[PDB]
Amino acid sequence: FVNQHLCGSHLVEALYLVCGERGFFYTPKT
Amino acid sequence: FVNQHLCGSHLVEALYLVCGERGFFYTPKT
Amino acid sequence: FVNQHLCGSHLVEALYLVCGERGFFYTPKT
Amino acid sequence: FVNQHLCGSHLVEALYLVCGERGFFYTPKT
Amino acid sequence: FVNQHLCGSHLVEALYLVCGERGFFYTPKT
Amino acid sequence: FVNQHLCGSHLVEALYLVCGERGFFYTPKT
Amino acid sequence: GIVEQCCTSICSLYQLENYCN
Amino acid sequence: GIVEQCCTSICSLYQLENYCN
Amino acid sequence: GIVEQCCTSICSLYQLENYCN
Amino acid sequence: GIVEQCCTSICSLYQLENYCN
Amino acid sequence: GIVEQCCTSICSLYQLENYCN
Amino acid sequence: GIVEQCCTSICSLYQLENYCN
Numbered sequence A, B, C, D, E, F: 001f002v003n004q005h006l007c008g009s010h011l012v013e014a015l016y017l018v019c020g021e022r023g024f025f026y027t028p029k030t
Numbered sequence G, H, I, J, K, L: 001g002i003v004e005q006c007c008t009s010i011c012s013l014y015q016l017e018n019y020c021n
């Protein structure tokens, strides 16, 4: 696997991709 | 078939735009 | 609804999303 | 079915790239 | 039908994220 | 055709779009 | 859920933001 | 146009809908 | 239109730019 | 290939990176 | 949160999976 | 490579096609 900066749409894409059937939470405010 | 998985990719990108700072939980099985 | 900056692909995505069956025009030159 | 709506998302992103500065009208019912 | 072509659009965007700096060859007929 | 800067996802999108059935190679390291 | 509702028919912006946090 | 309104500045839903057909 | 032409078969770049302004 | 494998069933990240260079 | 970890800094696979459900 | 040609600088259609297979 590669390590890189992931922001915005690519960060949500990454979450959707990695988490799979688990789903994810994207809470950018923190 | 993958169109449901493809559909989910568009869903989370749309939620990224619509929800903005308040974020979202993506739960494919819920 | 949230208010945010929308540029490039996200601006076209937003237009496609908001305008729906109406469609839209994206004229960036102005 | 949503694949036609999903197809339109790719259409306007492609038009964004191909058309560039000259822009485009997206008319789903035309 | 275009869903296979639509699927390929998601494939190369996913490969862009997953592969990172090592890049990738996209060969639809291979 | 228009000439513009193409980086990241838009560069891969452009390659996928232009190259078609040929496919492409995206080797960003060089 | 969102997959059942929005991958069968088109979900508008108003329907999608019901899934925001 | 839409760039100065919605990209450089921030647009509301009403402002974005000015660019629908 | 573009949906009828390009969501039935693959539209190349040359076919897509006919819809540019 | 990747189209045959990953457009019939969902390809995970672990399956997709086998196609990296 | 995820922004400071994965966007401003660089996250590993393990770090990104902290934001799965 | 493609980054210095097409991202940092501007490529033509002919230049982009240098990276097709």
Ligand SMILES: Cc1cccc(O)c1
Pocket (backbone or CB within 6 Å): B017, B018, B019, C001, C002, C003, C004, C005, C006, C014, C018, G013, H011, H012, H013, H016
């Ligand atoms: C700024 C804005 C308006 C409408 C919808 C959005 O997702 C974002």
Ligand SMILES: Cc1cccc(O)c1
Pocket (backbone or CB within 6 Å): D017, D018, D019, F001, F002, F003, F004, F005, F006, F014, F018, I013, L011, L012, L013, L016
């Ligand atoms: C720069 C460039 C070349 C070819 C197609 C495009 O959409 C953009």
Ligand SMILES: Cc1cccc(O)c1
Pocket (backbone or CB within 6 Å): A001, A002, A003, A004, A005, A006, A014, A018, E017, E018, E019, J013, K011, K012, K013, K016
């Ligand atoms: C940084 C990172 C982790 C996991 C997958 C990716 O594509 C990128």
Ligand SMILES: Cc1cccc(O)c1
Pocket (backbone or CB within 6 Å): B007, B010, B011, B014, C017, D002, D005, D006, G006, G007, G009, G010, G011, G012
């Ligand atoms: C934004 C979006 C994508 C896919 C299906 C939908 O109903 C809505």
Ligand SMILES: Cc1cccc(O)c1
Pocket (backbone or CB within 6 Å): D007, D010, D011, D014, E002, E005, E006, F017, I006, I007, I009, I010, I011, I012
């Ligand atoms: C670029 C693109 C996306 C979807 C269908 C097409 O014919 C072309």
Ligand SMILES: Cc1cccc(O)c1
Pocket (backbone or CB within 6 Å): A017, B002, B005, B006, E007, E010, E011, E014, J006, J007, J009, J010, J011, J012
């Ligand atoms: C990332 C991705 C997109 C489409 C199909 C797949 O199997 C995987």
Ligand SMILES: [Cl-]
Pocket (backbone or CB within 6 Å): B006, B007, D006, D007, E006, E007
């Ligand atoms: Cl799709």
Ligand code: NA
Pocket (backbone or CB within 6 Å): A001, A002, J017
């Ligand atoms: Na790996």
Ligand code: NA
Pocket (backbone or CB within 6 Å): C001, C002, G017
């Ligand atoms: Na709202």
Ligand code: NA
Pocket (backbone or CB within 6 Å): F001, F002, I017
């Ligand atoms: Na042209």
Ligand SMILES: [Zn+2]
Pocket (backbone or CB within 6 Å): B006, B009, B010, D006, D010, E006, E010
């Ligand atoms: Zn898609």
